[PDB]
RNA sequence: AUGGAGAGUUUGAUCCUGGCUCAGGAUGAACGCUGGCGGCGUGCCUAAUACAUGCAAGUCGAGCGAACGGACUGAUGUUAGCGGCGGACGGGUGAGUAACACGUGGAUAACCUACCUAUAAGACUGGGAUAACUUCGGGAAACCGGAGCUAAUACCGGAUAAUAUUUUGACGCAUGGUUCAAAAGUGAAAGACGGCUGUCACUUAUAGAUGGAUCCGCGCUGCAUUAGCUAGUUGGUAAGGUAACGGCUUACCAAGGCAACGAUGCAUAGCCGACCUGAGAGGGUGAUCGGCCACACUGGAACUGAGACACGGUCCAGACUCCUACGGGAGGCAGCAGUAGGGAAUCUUCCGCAAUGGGCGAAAGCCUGACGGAGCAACGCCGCGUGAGUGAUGAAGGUCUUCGGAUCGUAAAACUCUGUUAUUAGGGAAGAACAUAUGUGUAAGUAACUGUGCACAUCUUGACGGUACCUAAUCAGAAAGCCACGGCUAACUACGUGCCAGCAGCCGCGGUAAUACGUAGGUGGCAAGCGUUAUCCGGAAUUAUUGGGCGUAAAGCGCGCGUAGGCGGUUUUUUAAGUCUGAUGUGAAAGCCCACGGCUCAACCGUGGAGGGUCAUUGGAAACUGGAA
């Protein structure tokens, strides 16, 4: 635009909508209010453990878990790895990162953490997927 | 010593002889590993920039984030960024000791500086990364002046670069001059590491 | 009241001090009025001290009161002597 | 010392011993650099209210008079 | 000159447009796997949630009365108390606050200021009490109330005293100013000394310094799907009271005042120096350090005081928690540790006043969870390690194999070699300058002396701490892991599975011959760290001022008339608001950059510059923009 049009109407940049919104909100049990926190991870309770069919191009039974976080927020989280020991009423640690196939899963359950075991036979890539150094 | 590894496999993956002056790239001048003997593919721009950086880094035994830190100091000085970078590497105490001729290689000279056999300006300097300035004195510790390893290499060193005055008697050095690009290793393209860090 | 005192400017076990005219209520390393000089007690042998003369005698005439060791520092430059001469 | 002086235009004389003086000045835009005209209204004291709406007058600051006035009328130069 | 890199992805194929994603740098980070050391830092970002228990503000017996108590008349203590000063500092937190709160620049001829300094004038004369103590009662504590005594630098009354107030004459609007010549009325202390005086208590005036207070220009979040806001509101006239101006408050007048240049309202937020990112322009942020502000369980109020409407002060209300003989009482960690709770997440219920700073004291000294140090945490930055020289890129073993070999690989034994580290066994800093006391002179004032200021040299002391650090022996021994390897993007093979199990940032892979899944070898990138997640800048010219566009990709209102605003033909004269060029003042310090010096280097520290403003005052220029003719 012209300089005068810019002076009257300064340029407005676009706002950035962030992924993993449920990690950006805290809770205050005393005031019954939601806060803004920007947490790396959040801890929740598994209210449902099951398996989800993936998007159309792919075909594989993917394990997931419905997790109610520390907030009053109920999200769906992926379970990386082969074997998992999670049933209902399991405390998990949930990080960011979505699954492309699974529609409605925007988070990942951290393996090898509070009440979540690692992958039994993992030998290369043990930082991810939990599990300690064999021998 | 940080690397503490195979100095042949590195010089075989790289294109230069690092330490040894040819003894490493004689029978197998190709890359190490299972796929080493077979033919080599072409290298992209990034592969060539990274290769030359690894050439100079493994030549001096320094690690990253200290190679990079030294590179950052070089840009501050006047002149060509690449030239002052290699000048600063040639001014390291562990490198000056080897180029003086006190040791027979780079790694051994580091252990001579590290274990405190040097006594720069008559004072114990056991830091391999000490930056030697022109007009100093790189001597040898009195109790270490009867070291067989030191005297085994004091005579076979022969050529000493013009920016270093070496006394065979009393086991002393001087660092008379700032090294020029001529005296520096000629197998390293300085303009290719400058471009690597600008990526 | 107004005090001529030392402000710590050193790291762990390596203290450096500035000779500073400051209010007594102000924090040690906080608000000040004027910087007068420096005091390094960990230098080679003798503690190297640097003091200005015009401002130091200006604040002393205005009623600034040196602490116990600023008195020593002002004495090693004869500042307290010349302050005494002008009765 | 010196108290600041402004020259503006009388835009209100509906109150006794008080006039409103419009001191228009210029403020450049931080980003685009264009000078934009902006105006500021000053409430000034004049015991003998000889200023009438439309006069350019001379204004000088003073101690607080009333809740808003901080200026006095120094000189009236226009007639309108 | 010191500074600017792209790549993948729409199609049968292409060029555009356009979005998405990745490669970089960061953090008070958390999580996963690992983990040797040191030096500098950093460490409840959430519940301004609730707090068990210890400490965080006392000092002066040279101000003075003790039942005082008590060496030996009784040194010394403060048992307890009156009195003075301090408790308004220091420390903590960011709830509230969109405001002259904060930054910058000014103004106050509308202002207060204890201690400190200097100059003067003084400090006269009397009186009555009361703490403490004794003895009676109450009450379950907490405490409370009677009588009888006793001091003070405690209190009160007179004397005298200013530039204090009233009336008098001799500028920048409210004026300021210092002479005059009258009236009223405003004080005080003693203590410990020496031969009348010294010191440090006092009172009154001045100034200075310091610390506060108020006002103003400019700057300083989002929302217009928040458009009309206010009625002490806005101005005036009186009165009051405030350190002081002022609707600050109250009466009476008038109807005023602010607002598309965003009144008001809503939501959010402590502000700044500064930090991160960027080539820059900019964008994001307001941990640690420093300046300002506000707050102290929530909410009102005043007292004392120079200064508070007061974190470890008072009164009241409220919500909690505790005691009670039920009438009544006590409490406030957002001080330092520490506990419970919330959370992904953030530490010892430590030592010392040895240094610096602060309060009180003549000082010795006392207090100081300020501070100086230790404990824990790879949380970060920096530095050093975990070995080196020769040595067959052949052992034996893995993995492939074209069965010939190849690769791990000079890697290993193998000999020599060192002790950075580690162990033990001896030395062992700096930080220390003092204050006081002691002597010695000098200066001022002295009748003189004591005493004070100054000058010198003596004596003293360290938490850290037997800790840095050094020196001897001894050993390669006790010290590497993490992630990747389809392309972006450095690193490929075999086996297992067979659109399953699973991987994935995107393109996507996996359906019996996956360099994309799991494992094994090898490789590569880093390394006491390595990856993942969370958030910001970049790349993004993807808000384009620098630096984009609107025929068909998104975009010209359906078209006029027009108001504010924005812009505006040529010449001359003038002005100087912009513009340009100087000079002053300031833009604190700490930060960034440059240089230099000290830690063995570095991190770090300290010095000196530089830089930083729509800044204020004041000259100069007059082409352009602006004003006038």
Short mmCIF file of N, CA and C (backbone and C1' of nucleotides) in Angstrom, two decimals, chain E residues 257-304:
data_model
loop_
_atom_site.label_atom_id
_atom_site.label_comp_id
_atom_site.label_asym_id
_atom_site.label_seq_id
_atom_site.Cartn_x
_atom_site.Cartn_y
_atom_site.Cartn_z
P G E 257 -15.80 23.04 27.95
"O5'" G E 257 -14.87 21.80 28.30
"C5'" G E 257 -13.94 21.89 29.37
"C4'" G E 257 -13.66 20.54 29.97
"C3'" G E 257 -13.32 19.43 29.00
"O3'" G E 257 -11.98 19.48 28.56
"C1'" G E 257 -14.90 18.64 30.57
P C E 258 -11.62 19.25 27.01
"O5'" C E 258 -11.57 17.66 26.87
"C5'" C E 258 -10.60 16.90 27.58
"C4'" C E 258 -10.90 15.43 27.48
"C3'" C E 258 -11.05 14.88 26.07
"O3'" C E 258 -9.81 14.61 25.44
"C1'" C E 258 -12.84 14.12 27.40
P A E 259 -9.67 14.78 23.85
"O5'" A E 259 -10.58 13.61 23.26
"C5'" A E 259 -10.26 12.25 23.47
"C4'" A E 259 -11.30 11.33 22.89
"C3'" A E 259 -11.65 11.57 21.43
"O3'" A E 259 -10.71 11.01 20.54
"C1'" A E 259 -13.64 11.33 22.68
P A E 260 -10.15 11.88 19.31
"O5'" A E 260 -9.96 10.81 18.15
"C5'" A E 260 -10.90 9.75 17.98
"C4'" A E 260 -10.58 8.89 16.79
"C3'" A E 260 -10.69 9.59 15.44
"O3'" A E 260 -9.73 9.05 14.54
"C1'" A E 260 -12.24 7.81 15.54
P C E 261 -8.69 10.02 13.79
"O5'" C E 261 -7.49 10.18 14.81
"C5'" C E 261 -6.84 9.05 15.37
"C4'" C E 261 -5.83 9.44 16.43
"C3'" C E 261 -6.43 9.78 17.79
"O3'" C E 261 -5.50 9.42 18.82
"C1'" C E 261 -5.29 11.66 16.95
P G E 262 -5.75 8.11 19.71
"O5'" G E 262 -7.34 7.99 19.77
"C5'" G E 262 -8.06 8.39 20.92
"C4'" G E 262 -9.09 7.36 21.32
"C3'" G E 262 -8.51 6.07 21.90
"O3'" G E 262 -9.41 5.54 22.88
"C1'" G E 262 -9.69 5.58 19.91
P A E 263 -9.00 5.53 24.43
"O5'" A E 263 -10.03 6.53 25.11
"C5'" A E 263 -9.83 7.94 25.04
"C4'" A E 263 -10.89 8.71 25.78
"C3'" A E 263 -11.46 8.07 27.04
"O3'" A E 263 -10.61 8.16 28.17
"C1'" A E 263 -13.22 8.94 25.75
P U E 264 -10.49 6.92 29.18
"O5'" U E 264 -11.93 6.23 29.15
"C5'" U E 264 -12.95 6.64 30.05
"C4'" U E 264 -14.22 5.84 29.84
"C3'" U E 264 -14.15 4.37 30.24
"O3'" U E 264 -14.35 4.16 31.63
"C1'" U E 264 -15.14 4.57 28.10
P G E 265 -13.70 2.88 32.36
"O5'" G E 265 -14.28 1.64 31.55
"C5'" G E 265 -15.61 1.19 31.75
"C4'" G E 265 -15.95 0.06 30.81
"C3'" G E 265 -15.10 -1.20 30.96
"O3'" G E 265 -15.57 -2.03 32.00
"C1'" G E 265 -15.24 -0.61 28.67
P C E 266 -14.54 -2.91 32.87
"O5'" C E 266 -14.17 -4.12 31.90
"C5'" C E 266 -15.16 -5.03 31.47
"C4'" C E 266 -14.66 -5.90 30.35
"C3'" C E 266 -13.38 -6.67 30.63
"O3'" C E 266 -13.59 -7.85 31.38
"C1'" C E 266 -13.22 -5.63 28.52
P A E 267 -12.54 -8.29 32.51
"O5'" A E 267 -11.32 -8.90 31.68
"C5'" A E 267 -11.50 -10.05 30.86
"C4'" A E 267 -10.31 -10.28 29.97
"C3'" A E 267 -8.96 -10.35 30.66
"O3'" A E 267 -8.70 -11.62 31.23
"C1'" A E 267 -8.80 -8.95 28.76
P U E 268 -7.69 -11.76 32.47
"O5'" U E 268 -6.28 -11.31 31.88
"C5'" U E 268 -5.58 -12.12 30.95
"C4'" U E 268 -4.40 -11.40 30.35
"C3'" U E 268 -3.33 -10.94 31.32
"O3'" U E 268 -2.47 -11.99 31.74
"C1'" U E 268 -3.81 -9.19 29.82
P A E 269 -1.89 -11.99 33.24
"O5'" A E 269 -0.78 -10.85 33.22
"C5'" A E 269 0.29 -10.90 32.30
"C4'" A E 269 1.07 -9.61 32.25
"C3'" A E 269 1.55 -9.06 33.58
"O3'" A E 269 2.68 -9.73 34.09
"C1'" A E 269 0.64 -7.31 32.28
P G E 270 2.73 -10.14 35.64
"O5'" G E 270 3.31 -8.85 36.36
"C5'" G E 270 4.42 -8.15 35.81
"C4'" G E 270 4.26 -6.66 35.93
"C3'" G E 270 5.29 -5.83 35.19
"O3'" G E 270 4.99 -5.68 33.81
"C1'" G E 270 5.08 -5.02 37.39
P C E 271 6.15 -5.80 32.71
"O5'" C E 271 6.85 -4.38 32.74
"C5'" C E 271 6.13 -3.21 32.40
"C4'" C E 271 6.95 -1.97 32.63
"C3'" C E 271 8.35 -1.99 32.05
"O3'" C E 271 8.40 -1.73 30.66
"C1'" C E 271 8.44 -1.21 34.27
P C E 272 9.49 -2.48 29.75
"O5'" C E 272 10.87 -1.84 30.21
"C5'" C E 272 11.13 -0.46 30.00
"C4'" C E 272 12.35 0.01 30.76
"C3'" C E 272 13.68 -0.60 30.36
"O3'" C E 272 14.20 -0.07 29.16
"C1'" C E 272 13.54 -0.49 32.71
P G E 273 15.18 -0.97 28.25
"O5'" G E 273 16.58 -0.91 29.02
"C5'" G E 273 17.26 0.32 29.22
"C4'" G E 273 18.43 0.16 30.15
"C3'" G E 273 19.52 -0.80 29.71
"O3'" G E 273 20.42 -0.20 28.79
"C1'" G E 273 18.98 -1.20 31.98
P A E 274 21.28 -1.11 27.78
"O5'" A E 274 20.87 -2.60 28.14
"C5'" A E 274 21.85 -3.54 28.55
"C4'" A E 274 21.24 -4.70 29.29
"C3'" A E 274 21.08 -5.99 28.51
"O3'" A E 274 22.28 -6.74 28.45
"C1'" A E 274 19.07 -5.51 29.67
P C E 275 22.69 -7.52 27.10
"O5'" C E 275 21.78 -8.82 27.13
"C5'" C E 275 21.95 -9.82 28.12
"C4'" C E 275 20.91 -10.90 27.99
"C3'" C E 275 20.82 -11.55 26.62
"O3'" C E 275 21.79 -12.57 26.43
"C1'" C E 275 18.66 -10.96 27.34
P C E 276 22.35 -12.88 24.96
"O5'" C E 276 21.13 -13.56 24.21
"C5'" C E 276 20.71 -14.87 24.56
"C4'" C E 276 19.53 -15.32 23.73
"C3'" C E 276 19.71 -15.23 22.23
"O3'" C E 276 20.45 -16.32 21.69
"C1'" C E 276 17.62 -14.32 22.82
P U E 277 21.44 -16.08 20.45
"O5'" U E 277 20.46 -15.84 19.22
"C5'" U E 277 19.51 -16.83 18.83
"C4'" U E 277 18.47 -16.27 17.90
"C3'" U E 277 19.00 -15.61 16.64
"O3'" U E 277 19.34 -16.54 15.62
"C1'" U E 277 17.38 -14.22 17.63
P G E 278 20.58 -16.24 14.64
"O5'" G E 278 20.09 -14.98 13.79
"C5'" G E 278 19.06 -15.11 12.83
"C4'" G E 278 18.71 -13.79 12.20
"C3'" G E 278 19.86 -13.00 11.60
"O3'" G E 278 20.28 -13.47 10.34
"C1'" G E 278 18.50 -11.55 12.87
P A E 279 21.85 -13.49 9.97
"O5'" A E 279 22.35 -12.02 10.36
"C5'" A E 279 23.73 -11.72 10.43
"C4'" A E 279 24.04 -10.41 9.75
"C3'" A E 279 23.24 -9.21 10.23
"O3'" A E 279 23.81 -8.60 11.37
"C1'" A E 279 23.29 -9.28 7.85
P G E 280 22.87 -8.02 12.53
"O5'" G E 280 22.06 -6.84 11.83
"C5'" G E 280 22.67 -5.58 11.57
"C4'" G E 280 21.85 -4.77 10.60
"C3'" G E 280 20.47 -4.35 11.09
"O3'" G E 280 20.52 -3.16 11.85
"C1'" G E 280 20.30 -5.29 8.92
P A E 281 19.43 -2.87 12.99
"O5'" A E 281 18.08 -2.61 12.18
"C5'" A E 281 17.94 -1.50 11.32
"C4'" A E 281 16.70 -1.61 10.47
"C3'" A E 281 15.41 -1.88 11.24
"O3'" A E 281 14.84 -0.69 11.77
"C1'" A E 281 15.58 -3.41 9.46
P G E 282 14.04 -0.75 13.16
"O5'" G E 282 12.72 -1.56 12.81
"C5'" G E 282 12.17 -2.48 13.73
"C4'" G E 282 11.89 -3.81 13.08
"C3'" G E 282 11.25 -4.86 13.98
"O3'" G E 282 9.84 -4.70 14.09
"C1'" G E 282 13.07 -5.82 12.84
P G E 283 9.12 -4.84 15.52
"O5'" G E 283 9.15 -6.40 15.81
"C5'" G E 283 8.45 -7.31 14.97
"C4'" G E 283 8.78 -8.74 15.32
"C3'" G E 283 8.62 -9.11 16.78
"O3'" G E 283 7.28 -9.41 17.14
"C1'" G E 283 10.70 -9.89 15.99
P G E 284 6.75 -9.08 18.62
"O5'" G E 284 7.49 -10.15 19.54
"C5'" G E 284 7.08 -11.51 19.54
"C4'" G E 284 8.05 -12.39 20.29
"C3'" G E 284 8.16 -12.15 21.79
"O3'" G E 284 7.11 -12.76 22.53
"C1'" G E 284 10.32 -12.29 20.87
P U E 285 6.57 -12.06 23.87
"O5'" U E 285 7.80 -12.16 24.88
"C5'" U E 285 8.24 -13.42 25.37
"C4'" U E 285 9.51 -13.29 26.18
"C3'" U E 285 9.44 -12.42 27.42
"O3'" U E 285 8.85 -13.09 28.53
"C1'" U E 285 11.39 -11.89 26.21
P G E 286 7.99 -12.26 29.60
"O5'" G E 286 9.09 -11.49 30.47
"C5'" G E 286 10.16 -12.20 31.08
"C4'" G E 286 11.14 -11.28 31.76
"C3'" G E 286 10.55 -10.42 32.88
"O3'" G E 286 11.50 -10.31 33.94
"C1'" G E 286 11.55 -9.03 31.25
P A E 287 11.30 -11.16 35.28
"O5'" A E 287 12.01 -12.55 34.97
"C5'" A E 287 13.41 -12.70 35.16
"C4'" A E 287 13.73 -14.04 35.78
"C3'" A E 287 14.91 -14.06 36.73
"O3'" A E 287 14.58 -13.61 38.04
"C1'" A E 287 15.11 -15.85 35.21
P U E 288 15.32 -12.34 38.68
"O5'" U E 288 16.80 -12.84 38.96
"C5'" U E 288 17.04 -14.01 39.74
"C4'" U E 288 18.49 -14.43 39.67
"C3'" U E 288 19.52 -13.36 39.97
"O3'" U E 288 19.71 -13.15 41.35
"C1'" U E 288 20.15 -14.57 38.03
P C E 289 19.82 -11.67 41.95
"O5'" C E 289 20.88 -10.96 41.00
"C5'" C E 289 22.27 -11.00 41.28
"C4'" C E 289 22.98 -9.84 40.63
"C3'" C E 289 22.37 -8.47 40.90
"O3'" C E 289 22.80 -7.91 42.12
"C1'" C E 289 22.75 -8.73 38.58
P G E 290 21.79 -7.01 42.99
"O5'" G E 290 21.71 -5.64 42.19
"C5'" G E 290 22.80 -4.72 42.19
"C4'" G E 290 22.58 -3.58 41.23
"C3'" G E 290 21.32 -2.76 41.45
"O3'" G E 290 21.45 -1.80 42.48
"C1'" G E 290 21.50 -3.31 39.16
P G E 291 20.14 -1.26 43.24
"O5'" G E 291 19.43 -0.32 42.17
"C5'" G E 291 19.98 0.95 41.84
"C4'" G E 291 19.03 1.75 40.98
"C3'" G E 291 17.61 1.87 41.50
"O3'" G E 291 17.46 2.86 42.50
"C1'" G E 291 17.55 1.26 39.23
P C E 292 16.36 2.68 43.66
"O5'" C E 292 14.98 2.84 42.90
"C5'" C E 292 14.62 4.09 42.31
"C4'" C E 292 13.34 3.98 41.52
"C3'" C E 292 12.12 3.48 42.28
"O3'" C E 292 11.52 4.45 43.11
"C1'" C E 292 12.25 2.38 40.20
P C E 293 10.77 4.00 44.45
"O5'" C E 293 9.46 3.25 43.93
"C5'" C E 293 8.49 3.95 43.17
"C4'" C E 293 7.47 3.02 42.56
"C3'" C E 293 6.64 2.21 43.54
"O3'" C E 293 5.59 2.96 44.11
"C1'" C E 293 7.40 0.81 41.79
P A E 294 5.26 2.81 45.68
"O5'" A E 294 4.38 1.49 45.77
"C5'" A E 294 3.18 1.37 45.01
"C4'" A E 294 2.75 -0.07 44.90
"C3'" A E 294 2.66 -0.83 46.21
"O3'" A E 294 1.44 -0.59 46.89
"C1'" A E 294 3.84 -2.13 44.63
P C E 295 1.38 -0.67 48.50
"O5'" C E 295 1.44 -2.23 48.81
"C5'" C E 295 0.38 -3.09 48.41
"C4'" C E 295 0.78 -4.54 48.50
"C3'" C E 295 1.17 -5.04 49.88
"O3'" C E 295 0.05 -5.35 50.69
"C1'" C E 295 2.76 -5.78 48.30
P A E 296 0.11 -5.13 52.28
"O5'" A E 296 0.82 -6.45 52.82
"C5'" A E 296 0.32 -7.74 52.47
"C4'" A E 296 1.21 -8.84 52.98
"C3'" A E 296 1.35 -8.92 54.50
"O3'" A E 296 1.49 -10.28 54.89
"C1'" A E 296 3.48 -8.58 53.54
P C E 297 0.96 -10.76 56.33
"O5'" C E 297 -0.10 -11.90 55.99
"C5'" C E 297 0.15 -12.86 54.97
"C4'" C E 297 -1.12 -13.51 54.51
"C3'" C E 297 -2.23 -12.57 54.07
"O3'" C E 297 -2.07 -12.10 52.74
"C1'" C E 297 -3.12 -14.19 55.54
P U E 298 -2.45 -10.59 52.36
"O5'" U E 298 -4.05 -10.58 52.34
"C5'" U E 298 -4.77 -11.21 51.30
"C4'" U E 298 -6.25 -10.95 51.43
"C3'" U E 298 -6.64 -9.50 51.63
"O3'" U E 298 -6.69 -8.76 50.42
"C1'" U E 298 -7.73 -10.81 53.25
P G E 299 -6.18 -7.24 50.39
"O5'" G E 299 -7.24 -6.46 51.30
"C5'" G E 299 -8.59 -6.38 50.90
"C4'" G E 299 -9.46 -5.74 51.95
"C3'" G E 299 -9.01 -4.41 52.50
"O3'" G E 299 -9.23 -3.33 51.61
"C1'" G E 299 -9.77 -5.77 54.27
P G E 300 -8.64 -1.87 51.96
"O5'" G E 300 -9.66 -1.31 53.05
"C5'" G E 300 -9.59 0.04 53.46
"C4'" G E 300 -10.25 0.25 54.80
"C3'" G E 300 -9.54 1.23 55.72
"O3'" G E 300 -9.79 2.58 55.38
"C1'" G E 300 -10.11 -0.70 56.94
P A E 301 -8.56 3.59 55.21
"O5'" A E 301 -8.21 3.99 56.71
"C5'" A E 301 -9.25 4.35 57.61
"C4'" A E 301 -8.82 4.24 59.05
"C3'" A E 301 -7.54 4.97 59.43
"O3'" A E 301 -7.73 6.36 59.59
"C1'" A E 301 -7.58 2.83 60.43
P A E 302 -6.74 7.40 58.86
"O5'" A E 302 -5.62 7.69 59.96
"C5'" A E 302 -5.93 8.46 61.12
"C4'" A E 302 -5.56 7.72 62.39
"C3'" A E 302 -4.18 8.00 62.95
"O3'" A E 302 -4.16 9.19 63.73
"C1'" A E 302 -4.61 5.67 62.96
P C E 303 -2.78 9.94 64.05
"O5'" C E 303 -2.08 9.01 65.14
"C5'" C E 303 -2.62 8.89 66.45
"C4'" C E 303 -1.72 8.06 67.32
"C3'" C E 303 -0.26 8.48 67.35
"O3'" C E 303 -0.03 9.51 68.29
"C1'" C E 303 -0.40 6.14 67.00
P U E 304 1.17 10.55 68.06
"O5'" U E 304 2.49 9.68 68.24
"C5'" U E 304 2.81 9.09 69.49
"C4'" U E 304 4.03 8.21 69.37
"C3'" U E 304 5.23 8.85 68.70
"O3'" U E 304 5.99 9.66 69.58
"C1'" U E 304 4.84 6.72 67.76
#
